[PDB]
């Protein structure tokens with residue numbers, strides 16, 4: 162180790178469990194409320210409506226998501242699989 | 252924080268019906284005191300050596 | 301105020317430590333350089349003088365390094381404050397959670413000693429109501445989608461209201477657009493559209 | 503060794519204060535990133551998104 166010569170290491174205030182809890186809370190807020198919880202009280206919304214809401218922010222009309230929702234969901238799942246596989250391969 | 256759960260459903264939405272105008276204070280320092288230090292008055296006193 | 305007090309207390313304590321450094325001998329036989337000159341000859345007391353010079357140089361170098369790091373931090377904070385002024389004060393910033401918690405409207409800068417404060421004006425909702433929503437409305441096989449609002453229902457009828465306020469309105473053509481057929485959305489509801497041109501042509 | 507360290511006790515004061523400030527800044531860095539919300543939102547048991 163590196164502590165035998167008086168070079169003590171201070172433990173962090175927040176453990177990894179608390180950081181994981183914070184990240185999970187942020188994830189739940191961003192899938193169940195979108196951005197309402199980040200600027201006030203959390204408001205319930207369906208995820209397809211939130212995805213169309215994000216689509217409206219980039220100049221694409223929301224009518225295109227619901228026509229090919231399965232395609233976008235499959236693309237999202239494949240991208241999640243791809244990043245999970247790439248991170249396992251530093 | 253407060254352990255609370257958000258009711259989620261595929262056909263449930265929450266539309267606010269009222270608002271409150273709030274004011275948030277943010278403190279930001281932009282400057283500090285300007286000091287000048289010279290060796291001849293600090294390191295030396297009144298001695299030429 | 302915590303941010304404005306640290307930048308003054310740290311500088312004051314650094315100045316106090318600089319003053320305290322002259323009260324130490326740094327391993328010599330005296331602290332003041334006049335005492336060794338008065339009690340010892342300059343040819344012999346040269347090494348004590350040089351040791352004092354090295355100690356004072358080290359203390360001054362450490363003070364200069366600390367002040368440079370503090371000045372870098374102050375420069376970063378001043379850049380942040382300038383960007384905050386130019387965005388939140390000289391206009392309305394679309395960056396969420398940058399000009400305060402909530403939907404920013406404007407900010408009012410105020411003078412502060414060796415600093416600046418911003419009185420942001422946010423927009424947070426207060427009371428909300430649960431509603432049943434549908435992403436599309438099937439009128440005559442043509443799916444209607446809201447232009448800027450969202451379809452809501454109070455249990456019996458349907459309305460369209462904006463995102464951040466509840467303003468119920470009758471489902472009409474002026475705020476909805478058609479796209480494709482009806483059998484494309486996984487979740488749709490049956491309803492009718494006002495079409496306010498029909499009663500006026502009679 | 504300790505008796506000659508009183509001639510440089512001020513230096514030890516600056517070093518200890520700098521390390522304490524570094525530690526408290528490291529502690530404050532995590533609070534500014536992850537503690538954005540003060541309410542812990544529970545994941546709903548329904549996974550049909």
Ligand SMILES: *[C@@H]1O[C@H](CO)[C@@H](O[C@@H]2O[C@H](CO)[C@@H](O)[C@H](O)[C@H]2NC(C)=O)[C@H](O)[C@H]1NC(C)=O
Pocket residue numbers: 268269270426
């Ligand atoms: C929105 O919230 C504001 C703030 O509470 C409400 O204003 C209050 O209304 C009550 C009753 O009408 C008054 O007794 C208070 O004096 C009001 N307070 C202020 C600061 O004006 C307002 O009524 C709410 N609006 C709705 C539609 O519920």
Ligand SMILES: *[C@@H]1O[C@H](CO)[C@@H](O[C@@H]2O[C@H](CO)[C@@H](O)[C@H](O)[C@H]2NC(C)=O)[C@H](O)[C@H]1NC(C)=O
Pocket residue numbers: 454455456457
């Ligand atoms: C849901 O909204 C509808 C539309 O506003 C309500 O129906 C109206 O209710 C008012 C209130 O008494 C009546 O004066 C109108 O004659 C109603 N119109 C129709 C077409 O029925 C309805 O009451 C609301 N329901 C709830 C539970 O709030």
Ligand SMILES: *[C@@H]1O[C@H](CO)[C@@H](O[C@@H]2O[C@H](CO)[C@@H](O)[C@H](O)[C@H]2NC(C)=O)[C@H](O)[C@H]1NC(C)=O
Pocket residue numbers: 438489490
């Ligand atoms: C919404 O409307 C559509 C069409 O008006 C309904 O679809 C019809 O359903 C009946 C029996 O459920 C069938 O006999 C028809 O052939 C269907 N027509 C079409 C064009 O699909 C649908 O059932 C309605 N939904 C609800 C919940 O009432």
Ligand SMILES: *[C@@H]1O[C@H](CO)[C@@H](O)[C@H](O)[C@H]1NC(C)=O
Pocket residue numbers: 258265428429430
């Ligand atoms: C709306 O109703 C649901 C259950 O029907 C409940 O979980 C939710 O908290 C309610 N929302 C409000 C704002 O009362």
Ligand SMILES: *[C@@H]1O[C@H](CO)[C@@H](O)[C@H](O)[C@H]1NC(C)=O
Pocket residue numbers: 261262486487488550
């Ligand atoms: C919402 O999800 C429930 C549970 O899977 C399902 O029974 C219901 O049909 C869904 N409604 C819509 C509109 O998709």
